Design a protein around this motif. Structure first.
Motif, PDB file in Angstrom:
ATOM      1  N   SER A  49       0.839  -1.184   0.000  1.00 19.27           N
ATOM      2  CA  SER A  49       0.000   0.000   0.000  1.00 19.27           C
ATOM      3  C   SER A  49       0.877   1.238   0.000  1.00 19.27           C
ATOM      4  O   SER A  49       1.999   1.228   0.511  1.00 19.27           O
ATOM      5  N   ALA A  50       0.355   2.311  -0.592  1.00 19.02           N
ATOM      6  CA  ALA A  50       1.100   3.555  -0.720  1.00 19.02           C
ATOM      7  C   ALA A  50       1.497   4.167   0.615  1.00 19.02           C
ATOM      8  O   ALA A  50       2.404   5.002   0.646  1.00 19.02           O
ATOM      9  N   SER A  51       0.837   3.788   1.714  1.00 20.43           N
ATOM     10  CA  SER A  51       1.265   4.224   3.039  1.00 20.43           C
ATOM     11  C   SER A  51       2.656   3.722   3.401  1.00 20.43           C
ATOM     12  O   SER A  51       3.277   4.270   4.314  1.00 20.43           O
ATOM     13  N   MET A  52       3.159   2.696   2.720  1.00 20.07           N
ATOM     14  CA  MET A  52       4.514   2.225   2.954  1.00 20.07           C
ATOM     15  C   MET A  52       5.562   3.087   2.271  1.00 20.07           C
ATOM     16  O   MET A  52       6.732   2.704   2.240  1.00 20.07           O
ATOM     17  N   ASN A  53       5.177   4.231   1.724  1.00 24.95           N
ATOM     18  CA  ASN A  53       6.123   5.207   1.220  1.00 24.95           C
ATOM     19  C   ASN A  53       6.542   6.210   2.279  1.00 24.95           C
ATOM     20  O   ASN A  53       7.281   7.145   1.962  1.00 24.95           O
ATOM     21  N   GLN A  54       6.056   6.061   3.510  1.00 24.84           N
ATOM     22  CA  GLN A  54       6.491   6.919   4.600  1.00 24.84           C
ATOM     23  C   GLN A  54       7.976   6.739   4.857  1.00 24.84           C
ATOM     24  O   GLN A  54       8.502   5.628   4.795  1.00 24.84           O
ATOM     25  N   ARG A  55       8.647   7.836   5.172  1.00 21.04           N
ATOM     26  CA  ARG A  55      10.086   7.840   5.361  1.00 21.04           C
ATOM     27  C   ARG A  55      10.412   7.780   6.843  1.00 21.04           C
ATOM     28  O   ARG A  55       9.839   8.528   7.639  1.00 21.04           O
ATOM     29  N   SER A  56      11.322   6.887   7.207  1.00 16.44           N
ATOM     30  CA  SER A  56      11.827   6.829   8.564  1.00 16.44           C
ATOM     31  C   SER A  56      12.893   7.897   8.757  1.00 16.44           C
ATOM     32  O   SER A  56      13.226   8.656   7.844  1.00 16.44           O
TER      33      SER A  56
END
Lengths: 561, 232
Positions: free
Chosen positions: A16-23
């Protein structure tokens, strides 16, 4: 008979595109997930048993493209598919989990590993674990947001109704929930245990016999990956329940795992079914995926005869094992029951017992024949009193035991008594567990499962072209988009030549055509060649083979020795 | 079956091996439906990993050819033997091209030639009609397949179908030898004056061949056949 020495490692990577969040690491959640899979395999490879591990990849995409590496996909394909995952979809966790379990249960009916209606065999196992790596972001569909996890039931697999859950006995679901913040967390690197996550995947994880991991630091990530590597075991999850009064607690109910040790696991006695078989039932009752095993905390005697085949299964550490090893009674055992396995009794007759080891280091389940306190004295008297020459009273008592004895135990009991040395004790007849309609239905399911498995295995290649178009609105025709496969053959096609590059490239193709005298007539130089994939860029071992051999004469890596 | 399927990395090779040994002792054993049921169950073709092909039947072919010696003087034969003989021709034609094996092929063909042989022949014709109705190319027929078609010359329909393509191969330079064999077979078979022969003669009458030698030989053969029969 069944290869439990080749564990399946299914990875359900959230795409899902929410897994493009950056740590705070500067990498995305998806990059962390890919690195987590790579680290997991690096840690797993330290174990010599890691050879023969099946690695599978499923994503949150639609079913035609959800499966990237399924059955009969080699490791290099797995790596290539993992490297190129992109997070561009919705959080269809339930649908993707359903597809993953369907992929795991694809060949179960073909090979009859489930042993439907014939007892549950812990040695008929294909041990798999699903490690789903995701974030805590809410589940989404086109319509809206789902506040809870619900696996879809539409498009049921053939024979899916036989087990009332999608997951199976030898399957465990583990969630790696990435909660890595975008800021460098001020918390110290505390050596505490990993927290259970509070997302919608945690109930499903716990139900399957697995657990969820909440990660918010690379140190925590390593800790969860190490624990996950330690949790790759060949075994089946048993739903242990407490029956009777105490001798609302953690050890009252537990979805623990019992270990099955191969060498080709060997075993004789099945776990009883949750129903009494009959030859007039048109349909087989549905199965719980985890058998509800009830124990009585009574501390009975663990009776055993010398030559009997008894299956011993070591329980994994759990609060129930803690309780048993804390009461410190290794010379006594708790009788074990399956409810509704008998003709009339709700609790049913015993089939085994929990007996703590001599060292009080582990608790083992001893799977005995059905209603063993009645059979074992008779079975001992058979060889001790008359040397396998049954008497009238003994045969009558044996038949009376057979009335309470489910027909699906007949095969194992026949094999057991044969290997003691009394082959002619019972009538050599087919088991009366299943009606003709049930067996015909099972064979039809086997054929349908074979066809569906053939279709699914051939469908994992993603041999389709994305809809490269912009559907033009009126207020049919579409505007095309660039593709990966349309490599510009600028020498072979004049439409691929830009205007700014027209004259020099015209000169180049003219020279390529006319100056090919005692030369080479290839396509466009600098494109078809020198745009090699980076993996093959410096493959000198493969490159040297295409060159003629020479004459004989007599921190980790830096591209060579 | 589950052991054979699941443990495919080390499959049991004795399933095909036991067929040759058992067929040379108890011929009636091979007629059981258990082997047919097993074959039907295992006939699911998988593309990724499966044994969906048939093993070499050289031992079976040798046993079938050697069984003809024991059935040379037997006028009555079962329909199972007829079915086996019919199925034998549907192989890869391993020994069809060999001239030394002409006797074995002739014996195999004669074996299928009658209490239950009529029903067996009718079933064989019905099964082969699926391939017969297909418009297969003339060049697709191999040189070793001519013996198979010529051996089963009892059925007038097969002879009529073979003769129907005589005009089709008249213009083909590569089928001159088959055209000459077709003319020879037409001359030899002109002794019944049936519907099939009349249809073949009418079909071949309106075909004109540029070479004169072939037409002259056909005319001479026709004249000789007419002189041989009083019902011409």
């Amino acid at each position: 008979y069944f290869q439990s020495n080749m564990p399946i490692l299914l990875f359900l990577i959230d795409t899902s595109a929410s897994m493009n969040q950056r740590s705070h690491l500067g990498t995305t959640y998806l990059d962390t997930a890919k690195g987590a899979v790579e680290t997991f395999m690096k840690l797993r490879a330290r174990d010599p048993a890691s050879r023969g591990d099946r690695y599978m990849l499923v994503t949150f995409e639609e079913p035609p493209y959800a499966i990237k590496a399924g059955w009969k996909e080699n490791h290099a394909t797995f790596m290539n598919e993992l490297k190129n995952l992109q997070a561009e979809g919705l959080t269809t966790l339930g649908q993707s989990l359903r597809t993953a379990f369907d992929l795991l249960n694809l060949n179960r009916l073909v090979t009859g590993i489930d042993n439907y209606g014939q007892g549950r065999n812990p040695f008929f196992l294909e041990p798999a674990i699903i490690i789903t790596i995701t974030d805590g972001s809410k589940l989404t569909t086109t319509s809206g947001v789902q506040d809870e996890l619900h696996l879809p039931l539409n498009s049921p697999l053939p024979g899916s109704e036989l087990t009332k859950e999608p997951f199976r006995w030898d399957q465990r679901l583990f969630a790696l929930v990435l909660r890595l913040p975008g800021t460098m967390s001020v918390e110290s690197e505390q050596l505490t245990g990993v927290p259970l996550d509070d997302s919608a995947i945690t109930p499903m994880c716990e139900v399957t016999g697995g657990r969820s991991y909440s990660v918010c630091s690379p140190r925590m990530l390593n800790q969860c990956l190490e624990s996950l590597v330690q949790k790759v075991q060949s075994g089946v999850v048993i739903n242990f329940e407490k029956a009777g009064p105490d001798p609302s607690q953690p050890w009252h109910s537990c979805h623990k795992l019992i270990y099955v040790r191969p060498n080709v696991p060997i075993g004789h006695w099945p776990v009883p079914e949750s129903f009494w078989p009959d030859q007039n039932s048109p349909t087989l009752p549905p199965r719980t995926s985890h058998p509800v095993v009830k124990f009585s905390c009574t501390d009975c005697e663990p009776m055993v005869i010398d030559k009997l085949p008894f299956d011993k299964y070591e329980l994994e550490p759990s609060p129930l094992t803690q309780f048993i090893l804390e009461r410190k009674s290794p010379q006594t055992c708790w009788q074990v029951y399956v409810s509704n396995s008998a003709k009339y009794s709700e609790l049913g007759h015993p089939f085994g017992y929990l007996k703590a080891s001599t060292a009080l280091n582990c608790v083992n389940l001893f799977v005995m024949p059905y209603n063993y306190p009645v059979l074992l004295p008779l079975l001992d008297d058979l060889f001790k009193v008359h040397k396998a020459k049954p008497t009238l009273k003994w045969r009558q008592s044996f038949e009376s035991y057979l009335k309470t004895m489910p027909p699906y135990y007949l095969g194992p009991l026949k094999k057991a008594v044969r290997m003691m040395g009394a082959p002619n004790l019972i009538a050599d007849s087919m088991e009366y567990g299943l009606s003709y309609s049930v067996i015909s239905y099972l064979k039809k399911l086997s054929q349908q499962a074979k066809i569906e498995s053939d279709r699914v295995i051939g469908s994992v290649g993603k041999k389709v072209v994305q809809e490269t178009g912009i559907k033009v609105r009126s207020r049919g025709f579409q505007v095309a988009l660039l593709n990966k496969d349309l490599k510009p053959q600028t020498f072979r096609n004049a439409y691929d030549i830009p205007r700014r590059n027209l004259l020099d490239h015209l000169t180049r193709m003219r020279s390529n055509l006319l100056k090919s005298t005692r030369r080479f007539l290839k396509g466009q130089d600098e494109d078809q060649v020198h745009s090699v994939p980076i993996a093959q860029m410096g493959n000198y071992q493969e490159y040297l083979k295409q060159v003629p051999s020479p004459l004989r004469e007599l921190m980790m890596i830096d591209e060579a020795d | 079956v589950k052991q054979l399927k699941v443990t495919r990395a080390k499959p049991d090779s004795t399933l095909y091996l036991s067929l040759m040994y058992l067929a040379k002792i108890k011929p009636n054993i091979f007629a059981t439906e258990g082997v047919i049921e097993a074959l039907c169950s295992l006939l699911r073709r998988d593309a990724s990993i499966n044994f969906k092909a048939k093993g070499n039947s050289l031992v079976s072919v040798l046993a079938c050819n050697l069984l003809m010696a024991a059935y040379e003087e037997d006028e009555n034969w079962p329909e199972i033997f007829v079915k086996v003989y019919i199925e034998d021709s549907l192989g890869e034609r391993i020994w069809v091209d060999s001239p030394h094996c002409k006797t074995f092929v002739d014996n195999i063909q004669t074996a299928f030639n009658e209490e239950l042989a009529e029903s067996v022949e009718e079933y064989v014709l019905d099964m082969l009609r699926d391939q017969l109705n297909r418009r297969q190319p003339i060049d697709n027929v191999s040189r070793n397949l001519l013996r198979l078609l010529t051996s089963t010359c009892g059925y007038k329909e097969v002879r009529l179908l073979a003769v129907q393509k005589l005009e089709m191969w008249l213009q083909n330079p590569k089928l001159t030898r088959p055209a000459q064999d077709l003319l020879m077979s037409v001359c030899m078979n002109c002794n019944t004056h049936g519907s099939e022969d009349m249809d073949v003669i009418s079909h071949l009458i309106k075909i004109r061949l540029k070479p004169k030698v072939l037409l002259n030989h056909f005319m001479l053969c026709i004249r000789e056949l007419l002189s041989a029969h009083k019902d011409n």
